[PDB]
Amino acid sequence: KVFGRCELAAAMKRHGLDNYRGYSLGNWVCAAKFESNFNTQATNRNTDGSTDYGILQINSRWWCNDGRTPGSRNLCNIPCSALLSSDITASVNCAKKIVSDGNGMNAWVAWRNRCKGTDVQAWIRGCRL
Template identity: 55%
Template sequence: MTRLLLLALLTCLTSRVMGKIFGRCELAQMLKEAGLDGYRGYSLANWVCLAFYESHFNTGLVDHEADGSTSNGIFQINSHLWCDDLMHPSPNLCEVHCSDLLTSSLNDDITCAMRIVQTPRGMGTWMAWRNNCEGLDLSHWLKGCEL
């Protein structure tokens, strides 16, 4: 038990040190460079909207869910299916450790998000996207950004 508590504390401290809160346009540029604009039919504005409502552009965010899983990083990728948190067995469909989603580098987050939107639910996998972005005019998410 003490070991688990120490691991959880260390993970939280590490994520705060390594995480980053992106600016809206800075994030949009990075996501565009990574090829997300139009990926699986989703505009760049959809990805920016998703990141805002999931994490407020914070790569270091960890949300502890009622089922014991965690949602991690800028897209709040859940440990139940998508990443390994070392505490609960999971399919780890993105083949990544959850702590890798908490750094200022978005490579693992983007790769995993691309895998998630390949599922039949697409971006609908994220409730925050369904409730705040789906079917809406999202042009304001990119307004003023030099893309």
């Protein structure tokens, strides 16, 4: 599924992501835009053999199990395929764990490079919330 901007904002807010760990809704939408372009089915392979999955591009090296990342962890205790569903519940719960591990949203390199320090409120402007 490819979300619209305000559609994804409302779904993130319903799942408790707005202001989670101090990060306003616009930060999460911005990060979803540049990680996946709002597409739940997005996947990308990394050079070390791990793969990133879903709306927020969660890495198999640490967070989910895809059965082809030797030596990796499964800290969200989830199959990586669960992060590709049209329902964002699994991706949101895992992101909550990732953002709480000490480095904030700097875990998402596209957030640090393309969202951090910008006018992130523009990503929820004009949405009915």
